[PDB]
Amino acid sequence: KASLDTQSTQVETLKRNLIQLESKISEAKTKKEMLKARITTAKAQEQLQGM
Amino acid sequence: EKMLEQAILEMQEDLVQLRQGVAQAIAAQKRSEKQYNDAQNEINKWQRNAQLALQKGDENLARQALERKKTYTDTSAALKASLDTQSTQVETLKRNLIQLESKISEAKTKKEMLKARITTAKAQEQLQGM
């Protein structure tokens, strides 16, 4: 029973981490889209310099 | 898991060897008892012979039997002393075996607990990777 209680707390932490991770991966995908847009804007600025 | 797994296999083989030693000690106790029993039987036979010698009229033979009985008694006394010393050692061995049996079960339980903590540590490592 004592072992189970100690194990249960660890299990809860792991479950919480997984839920957080799921939220995090979605955010990362969103970040990539934002990152792609800024890079395109930078390229446009470079074209002006060429002119 | 590797450190724990190797230890469990090793303890079991050792226990079997200990049991054999205990059996030998038990066998030794039986042998001493048999020898002691034989000495007692011999003494009884000697006593009958001594009485028979008196009836026969051979005084020297009866006296010799009494001397033999004393020697047998001394041997029996020595055997009894040896048995007592051996018995204490045997009791300690038996106690150790019982304790060992309780201990091996505990070790198995410990491995399960150890496995769970390692898994938790791995989860923490994954968070660092993120």
UniProtKB/Swiss-Prot annotation, chain A:
It is found in: Cell inner membrane. Belongs to the PspA/Vipp/IM30 family. A membrane remodeling protein capable of forming rings and/or filaments on membranes, which then curve and tubulate the bilayer. Rings will form on liposomes, altering their positive curvature so the lipid bilayer is remodeled into a negative curve as the membrane enters the ring. Ring stacks of varying lengths can be seen joining isolated liposomes. A lipid monolayer can be drawn into the center of the rings. Required for thylakoid formation. A helical hairpin is formed by residues 25-137 which is conserved in all known ESCRT-III proteins. Helix 5N-5C (residues 193-217) contacts the helical hairpin 3 subunits away and is essential for oligomerization. The C-terminal flexible linker and alpha-helix 6 (residues 220-256) are not required for oligomerization and do not resolve in electron microscopy. Polymerizes to form rings, filaments and ribbons. Rings are formed by stacked rungs that tilt to give a dome-shaped curvature. Rings form with symmetries ranging from C11 (55 subunits) to C17 (119 subunits). This is Membrane-associated protein Vipp1. It comes from Nostoc punctiforme (strain ATCC 29133 / PCC 73102). The gene is vipp1. The chain holds residues 105 to 155 of 258 of the full protein.
